[PDB]
Design a protein around this nucleic acid. Structure first.
Length: 228
RNA sequence: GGGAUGCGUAGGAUAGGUGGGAGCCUGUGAACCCCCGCCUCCGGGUGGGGGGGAGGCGCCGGUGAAAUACCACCCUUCCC
Protein backbone atom coordinates (compact mmCIF):
# COMPACT_ATOMS: atom_id res chain seq x y z
CA UNK A 1 0.00 0.00 0.00
CA UNK A 2 0.93 3.67 -0.23
CA UNK A 3 1.09 3.84 3.59
CA UNK A 4 1.80 1.48 6.47
CA UNK A 5 -0.69 0.03 8.90
CA UNK A 6 0.02 2.61 11.64
CA UNK A 7 -0.85 5.47 9.31
CA UNK A 8 -3.84 3.70 7.75
CA UNK A 9 -5.47 3.21 11.15
CA UNK A 10 -5.16 6.93 11.91
CA UNK A 11 -7.07 7.97 8.82
CA UNK A 12 -10.47 6.95 10.19
CA UNK A 13 -10.00 9.21 13.20
CA UNK A 14 -10.16 12.36 11.13
CA UNK A 15 -13.33 13.60 9.42
CA UNK A 16 -12.10 15.10 6.10
CA UNK A 17 -15.15 17.37 5.83
CA UNK A 18 -15.03 18.70 9.38
CA UNK A 19 -13.12 21.82 10.34
CA UNK A 20 -12.11 21.35 13.95
CA UNK A 21 -11.78 23.90 16.69
CA UNK A 22 -8.26 24.43 17.99
CA UNK A 23 -9.31 22.74 21.25
CA UNK A 24 -10.59 19.69 19.37
CA UNK A 25 -7.39 19.59 17.29
CA UNK A 26 -5.11 19.80 20.34
CA UNK A 27 -6.91 16.80 21.86
CA UNK A 28 -7.09 14.83 18.60
CA UNK A 29 -3.43 15.17 17.51
CA UNK A 30 -2.40 13.54 20.80
CA UNK A 31 -4.50 10.48 19.84
CA UNK A 32 -3.01 10.59 16.33
CA UNK A 33 0.69 10.68 17.37
CA UNK A 34 1.90 7.11 17.11
CA UNK A 35 5.53 7.20 16.12
CA UNK A 36 8.28 5.97 18.40
CA UNK A 37 9.32 9.43 19.59
CA UNK A 38 7.72 12.60 20.85
CA UNK A 39 6.23 13.76 17.57
CA UNK A 40 6.50 17.49 16.82
CA UNK A 41 3.17 19.26 16.43
CA UNK A 42 2.89 21.49 13.37
CA UNK A 43 0.71 24.26 12.01
CA UNK A 44 0.25 24.94 8.30
CA UNK A 45 -1.47 27.91 6.77
CA UNK A 46 -2.20 28.59 3.12
CA UNK A 47 -1.84 32.34 2.97
CA UNK A 48 -3.83 34.89 0.97
CA UNK A 49 -0.65 36.56 -0.21
CA UNK A 50 1.17 36.91 -3.49
CA UNK A 51 4.46 35.17 -2.77
CA UNK A 52 6.00 36.66 -5.91
CA UNK A 53 6.20 40.16 -4.38
CA UNK A 54 8.53 41.16 -1.56
CA UNK A 55 5.98 43.48 0.05
CA UNK A 56 3.78 40.39 0.82
CA UNK A 57 6.45 38.18 2.39
CA UNK A 58 5.31 36.92 5.80
CA UNK A 59 8.38 36.56 7.98
CA UNK A 60 8.90 36.73 11.71
CA UNK A 61 9.53 35.20 15.10
CA UNK A 62 7.43 34.40 18.10
CA UNK A 63 7.94 32.92 21.54
CA UNK A 64 5.38 30.21 22.16
CA UNK A 65 3.92 30.47 25.70
CA UNK A 66 4.98 26.89 26.37
CA UNK A 67 7.94 26.61 24.06
CA UNK A 68 9.03 23.86 21.70
CA UNK A 69 9.52 20.83 23.85
CA UNK A 70 13.06 19.93 22.68
CA UNK A 71 16.64 20.92 23.49
CA UNK A 72 18.02 23.46 21.04
CA UNK A 73 21.79 23.28 20.55
CA UNK A 74 22.91 26.87 20.19
CA UNK A 75 26.23 27.98 18.75
CA UNK A 76 27.36 31.49 19.64
CA UNK A 77 30.01 33.44 17.77
CA UNK A 78 31.32 36.43 19.75
CA UNK A 79 34.19 38.67 20.92
CA UNK A 80 35.34 40.29 24.15
CA UNK A 81 33.30 39.76 27.33
CA UNK A 82 30.36 38.51 25.22
CA UNK A 83 32.24 35.23 24.83
CA UNK A 84 31.95 34.50 28.52
CA UNK A 85 28.46 35.96 28.57
CA UNK A 86 27.39 33.45 25.91
CA UNK A 87 29.03 30.71 27.93
CA UNK A 88 27.38 31.32 31.19
CA UNK A 89 24.06 31.94 29.37
CA UNK A 90 24.41 28.27 28.45
CA UNK A 91 25.29 28.26 24.75
CA UNK A 92 26.23 24.74 23.72
CA UNK A 93 29.24 26.06 21.87
CA UNK A 94 30.90 29.46 21.93
CA UNK A 95 33.75 30.57 19.75
CA UNK A 96 35.46 33.04 17.47
CA UNK A 97 37.61 32.77 14.33
CA UNK A 98 38.38 29.11 14.84
CA UNK A 99 34.71 28.25 15.34
CA UNK A 100 34.10 29.90 11.95
CA UNK A 101 36.77 27.74 10.31
CA UNK A 102 35.27 24.60 11.92
CA UNK A 103 31.82 25.31 10.49
CA UNK A 104 33.41 26.36 7.17
CA UNK A 105 34.98 22.89 7.00
CA UNK A 106 31.70 21.00 7.45
CA UNK A 107 30.80 20.95 11.15
CA UNK A 108 27.02 21.18 11.54
CA UNK A 109 26.05 19.53 14.83
CA UNK A 110 23.98 22.45 16.16
CA UNK A 111 20.43 23.64 15.79
CA UNK A 112 20.84 27.40 15.82
CA UNK A 113 23.58 29.96 15.23
CA UNK A 114 23.71 33.37 16.95
CA UNK A 115 26.29 36.14 16.83
CA UNK A 116 27.38 39.54 18.06
CA UNK A 117 27.25 42.14 15.27
CA UNK A 118 31.04 42.57 15.42
CA UNK A 119 31.72 39.09 14.00
CA UNK A 120 29.02 39.24 11.34
CA UNK A 121 31.41 40.75 8.80
CA UNK A 122 33.48 37.59 9.09
CA UNK A 123 30.56 35.19 9.64
CA UNK A 124 28.58 36.66 6.74
CA UNK A 125 31.51 36.63 4.31
CA UNK A 126 32.82 33.17 5.12
CA UNK A 127 29.80 31.23 6.26
CA UNK A 128 27.13 32.91 4.12
CA UNK A 129 27.27 30.28 1.39
CA UNK A 130 27.31 27.52 4.02
CA UNK A 131 24.70 28.54 6.56
CA UNK A 132 22.55 30.41 4.01
CA UNK A 133 21.09 27.48 2.02
CA UNK A 134 20.09 25.93 5.29
CA UNK A 135 18.55 28.85 7.11
CA UNK A 136 21.20 29.11 9.84
CA UNK A 137 23.04 32.32 9.04
CA UNK A 138 22.50 34.72 11.94
CA UNK A 139 20.31 37.77 11.34
CA UNK A 140 19.24 40.59 13.67
CA UNK A 141 15.73 40.70 12.15
CA UNK A 142 15.34 37.03 13.13
CA UNK A 143 16.55 38.05 16.58
CA UNK A 144 19.75 36.03 16.36
CA UNK A 145 22.24 38.91 16.07
CA UNK A 146 22.78 41.35 18.93
CA UNK A 147 25.03 42.33 21.81
CA UNK A 148 22.61 41.01 24.43
CA UNK A 149 23.78 37.56 23.36
CA UNK A 150 22.76 36.15 26.74
CA UNK A 151 19.11 37.04 26.21
CA UNK A 152 19.09 35.90 22.58
CA UNK A 153 20.56 32.53 23.58
CA UNK A 154 17.98 32.07 26.36
CA UNK A 155 15.16 33.25 24.08
CA UNK A 156 16.12 30.59 21.55
CA UNK A 157 16.86 27.88 24.13
CA UNK A 158 13.31 28.49 25.35
CA UNK A 159 12.15 27.53 21.85
CA UNK A 160 11.34 30.82 20.15
CA UNK A 161 10.30 29.91 16.60
CA UNK A 162 10.74 31.50 13.21
CA UNK A 163 8.25 31.52 10.35
CA UNK A 164 8.79 32.45 6.73
CA UNK A 165 6.26 31.84 3.97
CA UNK A 166 7.54 29.58 1.18
CA UNK A 167 7.58 30.62 -2.42
CA UNK A 168 4.28 28.81 -3.08
CA UNK A 169 2.46 30.99 -0.54
CA UNK A 170 2.13 28.47 2.32
CA UNK A 171 3.71 28.82 5.79
CA UNK A 172 4.61 26.23 8.39
CA UNK A 173 5.90 25.99 11.94
CA UNK A 174 6.53 23.64 14.82
CA UNK A 175 4.35 24.69 17.82
CA UNK A 176 5.00 22.03 20.44
CA UNK A 177 5.15 18.27 21.16
CA UNK A 178 2.32 15.72 21.11
CA UNK A 179 3.19 14.89 24.73
CA UNK A 180 2.11 18.40 25.81
CA UNK A 181 -1.14 18.87 27.74
CA UNK A 182 -3.87 19.77 25.19
CA UNK A 183 -4.54 23.19 26.70
CA UNK A 184 -0.82 24.00 26.32
CA UNK A 185 -0.84 22.94 22.64
CA UNK A 186 -3.93 25.07 22.12
CA UNK A 187 -2.11 28.05 23.70
CA UNK A 188 0.90 27.55 21.44
CA UNK A 189 -1.29 27.19 18.32
CA UNK A 190 -3.30 30.33 19.02
CA UNK A 191 -0.04 32.13 19.81
CA UNK A 192 1.46 31.15 16.49
CA UNK A 193 -1.65 32.08 14.51
CA UNK A 194 -1.77 35.41 16.36
CA UNK A 195 1.79 36.12 15.24
CA UNK A 196 0.96 35.31 11.57
CA UNK A 197 -1.97 37.66 11.65
CA UNK A 198 0.32 40.29 13.17
CA UNK A 199 2.38 40.00 9.97
CA UNK A 200 -0.43 39.99 7.44
CA UNK A 201 0.92 42.19 4.59
CA UNK A 202 -0.87 45.57 4.21
CA UNK A 203 -1.88 44.99 0.55
CA UNK A 204 -2.74 41.27 0.70
CA UNK A 205 -5.97 40.51 -1.18
CA UNK A 206 -8.76 38.29 0.15
CA UNK A 207 -8.95 36.02 3.17
CA UNK A 208 -5.53 35.95 4.85
CA UNK A 209 -5.77 32.47 6.36
CA UNK A 210 -7.13 30.51 3.38
CA UNK A 211 -6.65 27.21 5.18
CA UNK A 212 -5.12 26.23 8.48
CA UNK A 213 -4.20 22.67 9.46
CA UNK A 214 -2.67 21.07 12.54
CA UNK A 215 -0.69 17.88 12.19
CA UNK A 216 2.19 16.01 13.75
CA UNK A 217 5.41 14.72 12.29
CA UNK A 218 4.16 11.33 11.01
CA UNK A 219 0.34 11.51 10.99
CA UNK A 220 -2.55 12.86 8.92
CA UNK A 221 -3.79 16.49 9.12
CA UNK A 222 -6.65 18.10 10.98
CA UNK A 223 -8.16 21.17 9.37
CA UNK A 224 -8.90 23.87 11.91
CA UNK A 225 -10.77 27.10 12.39
CA UNK A 226 -7.95 29.58 13.18
CA UNK A 227 -10.43 31.78 15.03
CA UNK A 228 -11.29 29.34 17.81
C1' G B 1 -14.89 15.50 -7.43
C1' G B 2 -11.05 12.11 -9.15
C1' G B 3 -6.30 10.85 -11.35
C1' A B 4 -1.35 11.85 -13.11
C1' U B 5 3.23 15.24 -13.50
C1' G B 6 8.06 17.60 -11.04
C1' C B 7 15.23 14.56 -14.15
C1' G B 8 20.79 20.93 -15.88
C1' U B 9 25.76 19.47 -13.99
C1' A B 10 27.85 16.34 -9.72
C1' G B 11 25.43 12.38 -6.95
C1' G B 12 22.87 5.30 -5.60
C1' A B 13 19.64 8.48 -9.29
C1' U B 14 14.05 11.33 -12.17
C1' A B 15 16.30 16.16 -5.88
C1' G B 16 9.21 20.81 -7.86
C1' G B 17 8.73 24.37 -2.94
C1' U B 18 8.70 24.92 2.25
C1' G B 19 7.84 22.93 7.22
C1' G B 20 8.11 18.65 10.34
C1' G B 21 11.69 14.42 10.92
C1' A B 22 15.36 10.46 13.79
C1' G B 23 13.49 7.18 12.77
C1' C B 24 10.08 4.41 8.95
C1' C B 25 8.24 -0.05 6.64
C1' U B 26 7.75 -5.40 6.91
C1' G B 27 3.57 -12.97 7.80
C1' U B 28 -1.57 -6.64 8.29
C1' G B 29 3.95 -10.30 3.43
C1' A B 30 10.70 -7.33 3.12
C1' A B 31 13.97 -8.08 -1.12
C1' C B 32 13.32 -9.84 -5.77
C1' C B 33 10.73 -11.78 -10.39
C1' C B 34 6.80 -11.13 -13.79
C1' C B 35 2.36 -8.68 -16.52
C1' C B 36 -0.60 -4.43 -17.87
C1' G B 37 -2.13 0.94 -18.15
C1' C B 38 -0.24 5.71 -17.96
C1' C B 39 3.89 9.13 -18.03
C1' U B 40 8.86 9.75 -19.97
C1' C B 41 14.02 13.86 -20.02
C1' C B 42 14.28 6.81 -23.04
C1' G B 43 17.57 6.96 -17.45
C1' G B 44 13.58 5.24 -15.85
C1' G B 45 8.98 6.95 -13.15
C1' U B 46 4.18 5.93 -11.46
C1' G B 47 -0.52 3.29 -10.53
C1' G B 48 -2.56 -1.57 -10.36
C1' G B 49 -2.19 -6.76 -10.75
C1' G B 50 0.20 -12.30 -10.80
C1' G B 51 3.89 -14.61 -7.87
C1' G B 52 7.57 -14.66 -3.83
C1' G B 53 8.53 -15.83 1.47
C1' A B 54 12.49 -12.43 4.87
C1' G B 55 14.16 -8.64 5.73
C1' G B 56 14.26 -3.49 3.09
C1' C B 57 14.78 1.98 3.74
C1' G B 58 16.30 6.42 6.42
C1' C B 59 19.88 8.88 9.76
C1' C B 60 25.76 9.38 9.60
C1' G B 61 29.40 9.59 5.36
C1' G B 62 29.72 10.93 0.23
C1' U B 63 28.15 14.25 -4.17
C1' G B 64 25.68 18.76 -4.40
C1' A B 65 23.48 25.35 -4.20
C1' A B 66 19.97 21.95 -1.94
C1' A B 67 19.64 15.07 0.46
C1' U B 68 17.12 11.56 0.21
C1' A B 69 12.87 7.29 4.80
C1' C B 70 8.47 8.97 6.61
C1' C B 71 4.61 12.99 7.24
C1' A B 72 2.04 18.11 6.26
C1' C B 73 0.51 22.13 3.62
C1' C B 74 1.26 23.89 -1.18
C1' C B 75 2.76 25.08 -6.29
C1' U B 76 3.94 23.70 -11.65
C1' U B 77 2.57 21.14 -16.08
C1' C B 78 -1.47 17.99 -17.43
C1' C B 79 -5.42 14.29 -17.90
C1' C B 80 -10.76 11.98 -16.64
Amino acid sequence: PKHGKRYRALLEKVDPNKIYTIDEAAHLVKELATAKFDETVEVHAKLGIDPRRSDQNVRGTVSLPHGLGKQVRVLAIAKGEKIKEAEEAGADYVGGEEIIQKILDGWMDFDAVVATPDVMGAVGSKLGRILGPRGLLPNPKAGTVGFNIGEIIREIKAGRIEFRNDKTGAIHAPVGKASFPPEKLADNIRAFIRALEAHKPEGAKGTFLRSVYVTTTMVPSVRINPHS
